[model samples]
Target: MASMERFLSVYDEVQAFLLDQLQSKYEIDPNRARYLRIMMDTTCLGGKYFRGMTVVNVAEGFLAVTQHDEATKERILHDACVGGWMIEFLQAHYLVEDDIMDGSVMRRGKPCWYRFPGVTTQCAINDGIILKSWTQIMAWHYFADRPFLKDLLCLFQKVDYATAVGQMYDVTSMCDSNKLDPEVAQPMTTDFAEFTPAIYKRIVKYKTTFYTYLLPLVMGLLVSEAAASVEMNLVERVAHLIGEYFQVQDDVMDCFTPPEQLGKVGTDIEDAKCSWLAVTFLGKANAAQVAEFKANYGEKDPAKVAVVKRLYSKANLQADFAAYEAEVVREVESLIEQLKVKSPTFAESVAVVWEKTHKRK
Candidate 1:
């Protein structure tokens, strides 16, 4: 039950700073100003800032080890905060466009960016584009003067390009069911099934792991001049496992977490999202059961959803998922110990995974 307030505070500050810059630069009237404010606020509010916090935690670890004076700590913490906010900003860019693409009305339990009153399709499109641009501006301000500016930018380039490719594969794989090629379709579902181990791993690596684990940790190492440390590779493997577990826990909560507790209604099933659960269920399902799943679970129908849940129960998919959950945790523990580097920062990171994976009613 540790509060995420510290991270949230940094998140909010970055958002506010970004908005203020936008207003001062644009000089828009009150009505337009209100829209922009709401847009900025909405984007900042909902994300679970684990990736961002990882940057802070990793940087703090280096700080503790190197024994930096207070000034260096402040500057390093600022960089970490900026890096963390960048992740959320990147996420907002995607979400804004995605809401329009998916026609999502609610996000984080409130009206989505596009769903805000007095907003239009044109405005949303523009806002999404502008949000992306703002992140680039942030990168310039913080990272431009760093000694490894080119190298850092290269990392961003690789991460961004790779992520987009993965996202393209994800969208294409999900929608390509009608174009039959059973072999291709088979792995596609298991591999990128919006929520299965295959796709889940991809999503984390492409969408989160690099930014959350690799980016911040590597960046700190570079800044602290610890680029040669093989410890980073070890950290990367551990972080990857924990990050996926975080997403798996998210899928569980999507189905079961209370409305008041969850940010948005769990749309994983409703939208035929390729989640880890669906993938695992399909893996364990027989041919007839898979056909039944395609008929009921693949489309959006309330009655079908009920039936699919029953089928899932008949397959004991939940029990299987629970077993996998325990197994993964044990693997994570072993990995961490195998790395043989212990610090408060490492412990905190592992604790994050444990809390997320084991949450129950």
Candidate 2:
């Protein structure tokens, strides 16, 4: 089977397992169970499944290196798929909460879960908590007997905490005074001096990099039944680089790509997000240009947004992004090359992630 197909097949099995547990184990009422199932199916099944697929692909790649027997390979594949599903489940939990937190209207081109009919914000929050709890329940069910069970659980705990820390930084960095809640309304500033490249990168590292990149890669290695064979530090270094690249591209696309192409309206500017475009432009902008930025950087007005866009156009950010993309690609290639000599199969797996993310539109 193709990699995606294999991943999907396993995903189907994971979904079935979840349903069975809901019905037989949890003994949930049929009516309430129906709602929960629908929530899971709707929120978890869509998307590219990139992180989940990474788990399966990386595990398969490691198995290829070790040349495991077919029976062992099958077992590992099953475990890896379970791990993948856990990641997807965890992500769904994060998304449900994040959308509400950000006051987002849509996600994946549909109304946010909290905005769905009869779904109060409180219920949505509970649903997110339930999904998170389900991950631990499912993890214990599948991996309790395995030698690496503790490690797997620890990894999930660590990643979730790191992701939360990142989210805290991201939300705290926003300086929107027009917030409905006065407590959250701090002083609004157009001072580009407040946000630095270092801060931007820090937010990306905690917010996007650890969970999106390192988590799956590490999970794959751990569940591959080759925990002792892997050099986790090396994997972390390479994954962090790729994750930063992925997030920077996302930030750039948030500004450069149209809503139709990006599948959602970009809100970073209006939201006063600490984005790469804003930080990078500030780094190179002159005094007057900086004044223009400060005047128009963080407002919901279309004219203000237009002003920022014009500045970006004059700066030729697209060309600058092209140059930055090339630089990141070079760095990733060098890491892959180094891995190739020591761990060819692992290097091959990392290459797939790089290719998938690097030029993504």
Candidate 3:
């Protein structure tokens, strides 16, 4: 049976390419440029390359439809790899900024990109933007004369806009004390049981889904230029479900992973992120539980942290998350079966989904 090994191979190749490219850009030799490269490595480590593999999977479907020769197929695969890496770059961009915004101490088990010595918050933000610009430029270079270049560019722009909007809302919600006001921050309000979770899901969809799942999937379809309607529908449905699973699993890992295993301190809880687990807990918790959560969670006090964990236990949030996680996985499996009927090679996409769903440590 095919395993996540294939996806890891792809990830290693893409990461190596990115590192080499960055190294070439710097005038300094390997010795002097060591710090810069280490920073890049720190940011690049610890992500499932599902987004990049999704591009390859989608492109394979297109190749199958078009009956391309092996060489042509290989070329398309390379392009998909580039596109997938672009998705990774976009994520790295967002994360560097997010760490700064959240004042996060660690990411992927190490100090966050912004937390590096001599790295100012503003410089980290600029680095994030530079990462994105590099992604776009690489995309342009990869598909320079391809027929679908224009459409692909526009799709990426839209993804960027959606992500920016979500980020703006998130930052504003956190910084503006007035977000507690239902009138001023309707979408950001969480006092109501339903309002918070729904908005939280939307935020995850936009912030995490589009760039990671939707953009790569859609780009693959456009590049292949065959069966637009059917391909897009399949990509949208499957990728969305997979993306939700990806984010929720991340939320679970953030809260529960052993600090030693995780290689970093927990920042999501520390920063009061509007993660799925937090929203779900709020949605399900009783009044006393909610009060305990409000008083204890996000507070720097260790006593309060203990109280928050107790409240979370009372709500059985982890159990609830496991149930939701199972539901999404089952849904993804069913969707993959349906996709295989239309494209017999759908195993590639399913494999990509599996890599992310099951591979995290």
Candidate 4:
């Protein structure tokens, strides 16, 4: 709790550091440097800092749950600021890339970087690459002297690889509405052949869970030097569970929550994303309903998108996901119980992560 505000300050500090470096060290044009700075701010600053705070708070949770001298905790907390802000850069990387791939125009309540005036797909493409590299640059700059420097780099790269693969699965599984003919609009459903529960779970695990949930938790542990003492297999299990639930919640809110509340327009229906709501609808609908769904799913028309939502309502999917959420909560509560008895430090850290997420809108 205490470290959240403390860690949030690090985001601006990192931004300022980059601006100074770009101007002084690189001596790039003022206009060019200003664009880079604004790009960074636009992509990275608008998030709720949920994952970044998880890094800071988990480190603090370690301090609270484990035996640590005050001075040791002070240093660990400071180092966690580095870890927390790096996570923001990582998220910014994916957000920019995903918006381009999804053909999305809005993100964090603003025009996506790819949609900015004069910011073409080529520039936005390169910009996303820069956002990703910053995490590595910042990691090396900040943690190069630390003992787990190599470990941190390896961890970051591993997650990036997993996410790219996950995105591949997602991109290939959906029909690009941009490429489809208008004649097929009535029958151009998603890539339903790949819509199994296993694939969906795998997609969530790689695309979202590893970065959104696991990375922050493990980064906190590494910053605190608590990884070697704890059972990481257990940590991985809970992180996957948390990660999966996070995406499912996102899928639900994308359709159910107002765009204003969701902070962006919902595109899952039109994008043909292999979302929980879509899968649930496909599973319950009979042949005739499936035909109806296939005819309208993934169409760019707002009225057709509403048709998909009407089918979702017919399936009572919101209520179904509510039931699913109940189950997920109990499962995580059980895992939290297990972690408490096995590793008090992790139990405390994970409890806070779940608390922040499970209760949020």
Score each candidate by Cα lDDT.
0.66, 0.83, 0.69, 0.82
Q: How far is candidate 1 from the true structure (C-alpha RMSD, Å)?
A: 4.6
Angstrom error of the Cα, residue 283, model 1: value is 2.1
- lDDT string, candidate 2, 73-109, tens digits: 8888888888888888899999999999989987888
Least accurate stretch of 10 residues (summed lDDT) in model 3?
Answer: 186-195
Task: Kindly list the per-residue Cα lDDT of model 3 for residues 1-361, writing each as its tens digit.
Answer: 1224544565566556555765777554675356555555566557666666677777766665577778877777777677777777777888898788777777766678887777778668877777777677677767788887788788888998888887865555433344456465334333534337667777777777778777876776666664343455766787777777778887777777788877676656555667776788877877877776766666567777667666666778878877887887787777777777766555465556566666655
Ten contiguous residues with the weakest lDDT in model 1? 186-195
Return the lDDT, model 4, position 125.
91
Q: Candidate 1, residues 1-361: lDDT per residue as tens digits? A: 1225556676567666666776788776767767777777677556666556666666666676677778877777777677666766666877888778777777777877877777777788888887777667777877778775566667766766766665655455455445556466432343233444665577656655655556655655555555554365676787677666666677767766776788666666766666676778877888888878877765567888777778767887678877877887788777767654534455555555455545633
RMSD vs true structure, all candidates: 4.6, 2.6, 4.6, 3.6
lDDT per residue as tens, model 4, 1-361: 4666777677777777777877789888889988998898888886789888888887877787668788877778877888888888888988898899888878878898999997888999999999988887778777778997888888978988898887876765565434455565434334476566787898789888988888999998889887876778878989999888889988898998999888788988887778888888877889988888888888789999999999898888878788888998998998888887757777877988888788887
**Candidate 4, which segments miss by more than 4 Å at Cα?**
65-71, 175-191
Query: Which candidate, 2 or 3, would have the higher TM-score against the true structure?
Result: 2
- Tell how far residue 19 is off in model 4, in angstroms: 2.7
Tell me, by TM-score, which candidate is best. Answer: 2
Estimate TM-scores for all models: 0.80, 0.93, 0.79, 0.91
Ranking 1 against 2 by lDDT, winner: 2
Root-mean-square deviation of candidate 3: 4.6
Give the CA lDDT, 0 to 100, for residue 313 in model 2.
Answer: 85
